[PDB]
Symmetry: D2
Subunit: 46 residues, 4 copies
């Protein structure tokens, strides 16, 4: 079937893009942590 071949291509795209979302979310959490280090460095300022 050609619908079954299309479903396989789509399922494979969704996993690739979904891992990319997951990678990018992970990077965002580390950038939120850097903001906590930036905030912590702001009260140690004075």
């Amino acid at each position: 079937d050609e619908i079954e071949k299309q479903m396989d291509r789509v399922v494979k795209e969704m996993r690739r893009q979904l891992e990319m979302i997951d990678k990018l979310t992970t990077r965002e959490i580390e950038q939120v942590e850097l903001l906590k280090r930036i905030h912590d460095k702001l009260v140690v300022q004075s």
Copy 2:
């Protein structure tokens, strides 16, 4: 000095770009889920 705040500004602009990428990529995922149900609907039609 004000290298903390300039760094935070670089981080804030970074998170916007990457959170937009997450958002655009999630949006594409939802459109692929609906194509997936159109495939499911095309499978009962076939």
Copy 3:
């Protein structure tokens, strides 16, 4: 066994709801980064 199509239909509806939730939370995140940009602007008006 046309229960795989019933399973596939159950999964696609599940993924759309959970994916819409991801999309709402990301959208909320962007509003908070801009709130963070307003905080950044208030910090330069303060030190300077």
Copy 4:
């Protein structure tokens, strides 16, 4: 307000987005696990 109180707003915002950011990450992993069952559905559908 006071620079000591802007940091409190930034601190509340930073902790909020991290919690919501963890939630996005939780749902994305759950989504990847469903695409896997979606691939198992396709493979069980081609054997038919």
